[PDB]
Paper text:
Fumarate addition is accomplished by X-succinate synthases (XSSs), which are members of the glycyl radical enzyme (GRE) superfamily. The denitrifying betaproteobacterium Azoarcus sp. strain HxN1 has been shown to degrade saturated alkanes, including n-hexane, n-heptane, and n-octane. A homolog of the catalytic BSS subunit has previously been identified in strain HxN1 and is thought to catalyze the addition of fumarate to these alkanes at the C2 position, thus producing (1-methylalkyl)succinates. As such, this homolog is referred to as (1-methylalkyl)succinate synthase (MASS).
Here, we present a structure of the MASS complex solved by single particle cryogenic electron microscopy (cryo-EM). We were able to build a molecular model for a MASSα2βγ2δ complex using the high-resolution EM map. One MASSα protomer is more complete than the other (MASSα: residues 15 to 839, MASSα′: residues 36 to 677, missing density for loops 375 to 380 and 588 to 593). Both MASSα and MASSα' bind one MASSγ protomer in a similar manner as BSSα binds BSSγ. One protomer of MASSβ and one of MASSδ are also bound to MASSα; however, there is no density for either of these subunits on MASSα′. Comparison of the α-subunits reveals that the GRD is completely disordered when the β- and δ-subunits are absent, consistent with increased GRD mobility in the absence of these subunits. However, instead of finding density for the predicted [4Fe–4S] cluster, the density was consistent with the presence of a single Fe ion. Furthermore, when we compare the overall fold of MASSδ to that of other known proteins, we observe that MASSδ has a rubredoxin-like fold, a fold associated with the binding of a single Fe ion [Fig. 4B (33)]. Like BSS, one carboxylate group of fumarate is held in place by an oxyanion hole created by the Cys loop whereas the other carboxylate group forms an electrostatic interaction with an active site Arg residue (Arg508 in BSS, Arg492 in MASS). In BSS, BSSβ is the only barrier to toluene entering the active site; however, in MASS, Trp185 blocks the substrate channel as well. Specifically, we propose that MASSβ gates substrate entry, whereas MASSδ regulates GRD conformational changes.
Author numbering:
A (entry chain B): 2 to 119
B (entry chain F): 3 to 53
C (entry chain C): 2 to 54
D (entry chain D): 1 to 69
E (entry chain A): 15 to 839
F (entry chain E): 36 to 374, 381 to 587, 594 to 677
Write the structure that this text describes.
Amino acid sequence: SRRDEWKKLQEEMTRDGGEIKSLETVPEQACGICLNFTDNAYGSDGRGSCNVLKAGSNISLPDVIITRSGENGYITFFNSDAKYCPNFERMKLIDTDGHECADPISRRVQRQLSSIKK
Amino acid sequence: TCKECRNYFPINEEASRGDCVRRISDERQSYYTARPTTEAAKCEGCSDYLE
Amino acid sequence: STCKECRNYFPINEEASRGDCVRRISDERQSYYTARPTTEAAKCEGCSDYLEN
Amino acid sequence: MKCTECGHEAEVMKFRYHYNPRIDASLSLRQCPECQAVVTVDELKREVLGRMHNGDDPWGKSAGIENLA
Amino acid sequence: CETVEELRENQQWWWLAERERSARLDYLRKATWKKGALGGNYFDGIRLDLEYPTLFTEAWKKYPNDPSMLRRAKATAYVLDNISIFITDSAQLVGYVGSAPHTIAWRVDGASTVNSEVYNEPGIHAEPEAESLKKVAEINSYWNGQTAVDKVGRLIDPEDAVKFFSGAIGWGTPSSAFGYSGKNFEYFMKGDRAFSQIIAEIDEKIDEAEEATIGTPSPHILPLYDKLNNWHAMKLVLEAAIRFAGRYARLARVMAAKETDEQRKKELLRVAETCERVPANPPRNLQESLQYEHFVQVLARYEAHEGAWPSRPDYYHGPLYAKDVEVEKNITESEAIDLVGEYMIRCSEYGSFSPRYMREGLQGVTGTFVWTLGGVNQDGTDACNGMTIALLKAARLVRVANPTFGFRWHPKVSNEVLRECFECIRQGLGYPTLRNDPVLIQNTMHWYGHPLEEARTWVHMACMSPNPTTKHGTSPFRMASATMNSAKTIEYVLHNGYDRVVNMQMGPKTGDAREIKDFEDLFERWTVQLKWLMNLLVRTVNLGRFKDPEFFGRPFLSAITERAVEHGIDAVSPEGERGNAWVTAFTWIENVDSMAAIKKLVFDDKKYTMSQLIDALEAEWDGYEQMRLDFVKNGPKWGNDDDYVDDIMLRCLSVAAEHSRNIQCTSGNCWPILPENVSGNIHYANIVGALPNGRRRGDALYDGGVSPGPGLDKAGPTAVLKSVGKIDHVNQGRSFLLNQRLSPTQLAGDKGFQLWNSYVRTWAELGIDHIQFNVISDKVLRAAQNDPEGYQEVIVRVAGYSAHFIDISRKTQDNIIQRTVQGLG
Amino acid sequence: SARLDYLRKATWKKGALGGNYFDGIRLDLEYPTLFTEAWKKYPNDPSMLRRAKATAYVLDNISIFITDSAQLVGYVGSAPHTIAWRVDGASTVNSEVYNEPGIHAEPEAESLKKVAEINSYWNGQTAVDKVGRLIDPEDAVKFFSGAIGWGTPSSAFGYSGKNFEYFMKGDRAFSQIIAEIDEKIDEAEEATIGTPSPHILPLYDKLNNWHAMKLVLEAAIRFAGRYARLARVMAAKETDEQRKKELLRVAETCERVPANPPRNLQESLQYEHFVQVLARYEAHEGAWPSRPDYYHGPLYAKDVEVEKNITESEAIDLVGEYMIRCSEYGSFSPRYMREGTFVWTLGGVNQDGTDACNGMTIALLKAARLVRVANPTFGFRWHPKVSNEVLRECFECIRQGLGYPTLRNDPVLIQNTMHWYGHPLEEARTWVHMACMSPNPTTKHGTSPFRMASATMNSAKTIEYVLHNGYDRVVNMQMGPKTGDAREIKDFEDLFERWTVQLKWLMNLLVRTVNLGRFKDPEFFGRPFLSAITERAVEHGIDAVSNAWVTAFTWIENVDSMAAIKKLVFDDKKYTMSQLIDALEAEWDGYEQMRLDFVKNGPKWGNDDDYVDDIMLRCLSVAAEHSRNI
Ligand SMILES: O=C(O)/C=C/C(=O)O
Ligand code: SF4
Ligand code: SF4
Ligand code: SF4
Ligand SMILES: [Fe+3]
């Protein structure tokens, strides 16, 4: 059933509600500053994908579920907390400049990340 | 909680989830009733709990 | 006091209570006039543009 | 390669690739991972030559009648 | 210093135009806050409007039970009643979408992602940043979830929703919230119908409907109730519009009281009388007509985003301009030029918050605003008049980048009009963009089966696509939101339908690459990928258009269209409308150029195996720079009059056109493809990886829809014309953007017009529908790059629209500078 | 039998005596609470999908019970003594639930607090509220004022027809319907990922409808599984061997049906009772269309007479307990509507049309005789060649005074259905009693999915409006059209014209309201389960409910007044035209002699007087043509 898989992916994309309330600050270790984070290009809402983690991973809970074998990447947002992710790595080059067109790999244009010096 | 109660019953050996069974005798008829219960739920204000 | 005594208030009619608060704003690029509905009975309260008479 | 501003001595992949206006030529814009300075690179022989300022035009044009390389 | 004579001799046009224009025009031109996006960020002084979202949310909460369109009508009526309205110091035309000149409007229920981007956007919030962000978050919390785009995403197949909004293959939003719409100018802009007349018609329809619904019960009256609500909504919003105009009039009179200058007092009184006349009653002079049209557009932009400006100013303001300036000389020619230039300035001032793909895809402009000039009447005679000359002169004087001109060229165009259009081009405005009118008429007739008379009235919808303004011809929805990244097809053929950008398997598994036996297999794979992409985008946009009346609702647009007023339907409903739907194809050339490179170096040369090519593409030409140069130079390129690539281009267009005829829109019409890029060649510059045509990820894609790549063409402009002429514009596609650049030195002096006219005759004889020109020196653009201190009026034509140079992103600037400087002769 | 006696004695009657419930009956609060929570959970779902999810949540979390000697299970409510409440039926119904005395639990303060909170949530979001808002505001205020009449224009109340041929032949059960729905869903998914076209655009919301249709059946199967688990638990507790066997058989029955087609008579009866119960968890369903002797026919004949699987007396025992389970159902109804009756059809003819009567007709008659329930009254369909023994049993049953069977002349009813419906002849044979005077076939296309509640018309306020120029003293409002002052008239024919122009408006008001409700109810009030069990809805993926006739109340007193006015005032001239108006404005106060005269010589209906019958025939004939026009 591909329908269930794509429904799960869509529900993970629509991470709205309390999480929208959470946008005030970014944690010390965030997905948005991880090297393995690829920012979304459709909008600057902070959604993205993970190059390493796959499919139904989960890093929010202390007992993280890590599934590195799969077809589709893991949907993470720029403010998700990375203190429980085994594969987190602070990216060495953070281009906070928002006056240039989107670079999903290495550009972070969110307001909260504007003050995150390397 | 529920686990120690007389009327709580697990759906399957491996299922934490049970169905609560209450034996009730009304003016005209006595009958059984069931309602789901999670078995981890606090008895709290439960008047029908039995040892 | 209220919007009645403010110099920036202009009633739409000589009898009507409702009016327009009209203010002159100056920007670094341009100066203009802005109009905004007001009931003329609302207190000034925290109004930084209020100017009596 | 050897960054001009700082002797970082990284690999060609490590420098961040910006863009190349002249698709037929071999010269583009890359950013040093250490000093973050934008410099001009020669992809053909893989070394950095000079930093890139706003007014400079290193590429030129391979066609047209006005500003050829 | 910088004397007019010196400026003409040294070829400066921005400072010359600054010197030439009058004091009022100069003040109104320097009083505009630029609403374009530098990359993804707005101008520093720009602020987000909180008045409109707060008022709209407050009014929207008051009627939970009302239908979508009636509820939106009530909400926008409340906003128009309570929004701040302003008049600039020296303005004769009033109207604005927002609460202050330095402020952009926010589409609250456009999308939840857009609201999140609003919260995340830096520098657009007021001085109490904590308080402003708190208010924005309070708005978002209510408006998160019940948004129309969210409903569309929850309705379509989940795979389509995930892939479409992934930002890799689509450049559109399937709702009326963002996009544009067609205006039925034949209904409300013919001198006999204004808002009061439309209200009278709506009242008659409401009366007959209520009489039907109060008497004998029969099933025919069953669908009437919804119609009644629709009619009420339309009437309500129309009334609000009149009240809105009344507000301005009152303010004008108040200003007239304060002013101690007799001339300014007289002008303010004239503005008050104008706002009292329009939009309630049909215009009687030029100023009233301009105010009527501007009011209609401003109300439409209060209704929704409206990222395009469809209008034909010389055809509908032409009669009143002729009556005023020429027939009876009410106003001098100078005052007419002043009015037209300030009307264009008022057009430019519009600004609204748009998604990141729109913001980056439209560098320096809120949207693409194209005004149609010239053309023919419904009878077929020349429709050009003195209003066209006035518009061209005003555009030259003001030097406003965003409102561009599309001139419908036909063989009997008077020579003076051609000379004025060439003068506008030579100044560096980038417009008017000449369009071959007869072939475009034939294209509309062939694709959508429009009658000839209806087809003759077409105006540009956003950038290139013709669209008639008649009762049935006009289209009320941006069906072109099924934009496609064409390079994705060939990139998915070479990566087995896997996209690294979104870390997701996007395309169908057409088969493993690295083992393509012959060119036929590769072309079949590409055909499969192209059909998949077209089907996905068209299905998504079709469902968006189908469900828009329920999800979004449009009271004003339905109020100003004959179809909706007559039948009581929503405007975007396909009940009585011809489809007029097309697909835009970004970066189309990349596919055929990669085809040519592969077909030459792999199969017909055996210079490289497919394995080496795929490995180099995976490594992104790292360590294969010599291989990349071989693929660039040896591989034949489009635009050199070489049959090797041109036949591949024709085959690709043929299969695309066949698929377009196969698929159908909501109205059952076709879906022709339109190659064009705008600034999407820069938005997607990091979304498309390396390709066999020699591109590397992060490089800019090709400038235009069917124009040669940067420096790839070598034979000259004539070869480009011949290559583009092989395309059957009537049959192969909807339209083809042909960007070009001309040397300012050649076009200077007496003989520049003769060379341009010879090129135009060559372009017209080959049947090429569209041509664009860019006339600006490289030295000026380099100086503007070094310091933007003085070059605030330097304009460059990007793709289908013009923008100020110091406003677009640095990558776009460097790419536009790189374009070939063709030499006429 | 002893079990039948115990089950009959153990029922809490849901009928209303004198227009009120019995003391023991209570309002169920668990069902509205669970439904409201589930409704709150999903705001974005369409109406039918949201209702399906809410009903699934309720069925998962509702309290279920098995009586001490019960052989069949399934109840609409959390306890045998409680009553069902249609929480989102009508705001008037909710307010009347709040007002109604005697059906609230011992913590009356807390119970009324919960009821008030529920009403507060559902106030302004009800289907009838949506119908009233869509109609013109003046019409809404007139209709819901209560002066003209009382009506509920929505699918939450009304009569539902069941596609028995679809799911009760024995070929199909809920699993087979789920399989067919899965086939339709897979085909639609294949279409929606194919070639773009306007044809596939309707299929999306159709997919949602199919999803709701599947969800409700899955929920129903889980519900039966819950009952089976309870049966197994009770078997574990109990010691008596016979009750052990009965409980194990109940568990097996709940496991077999409604998931799979029944194999024996008990499974058939339980499957049908489950279908009915799940139907009544969806809306009010004021009728019981089912016929037992036909669709259970083959299974009972196989079990009892073909192979002697079960003893003969056990068949009558099971049928009696089935009718007992039928009687236990009840839902709250508005006081005006509470003043219907579950009617079955027996005998009849087959699809071909030859002697559908079988041994289970005799079984049903005997079970009704010994059980003596009042509400499940079944009329018999008499063909010219009914067996003599069946009629002997029917006459013996009518002798006991049960009030049934009410023999129906089958051929003339068949011809009536043939004439005004135009159904195929074979389809017309297989019809059941849907409404008090309406038959409806049970085939695929023949079956009517849903009929409206038949709103009530006050046939007396129109005369008062005529003589008061459209103004009622009861409510200070102008409702009827102002035709003219009653003081100036010419003849009783002119008075008839004024009365007719009043009555046409009065009737058109109700007809328009009910028609708009019927048109809009797919969006206002979805019906997932009803759509699930109808072949048309499953095949086309549409809501099942996609003519309206209104009952007349107090029409006889008005014709009495008309006869008195036509004869006394004009024909006999005893009183002038103004005096009656002056007496009516004072409500006959101080005019006792004139009131007594006006009622005395003013002939009452039933005198067998041609002059009175004249006005009766005129008043009914004029309305009959208007009803025909509508
Ligand atoms: O909506 C678009 O992308 C294009 C429109 C046009 O070319 O008119
Ligand atoms: S922190 Fe973990 S989940 Fe997040 S982007 Fe980095 S590797 Fe992926
Ligand atoms: S009686 Fe109370 S404690 Fe015992 S099983 Fe039931 S709910 Fe749990
Ligand atoms: S400035 Fe303030 S007090 Fe004065 S009129 Fe305006 S709102 Fe009222
Ligand atoms: Fe460096």
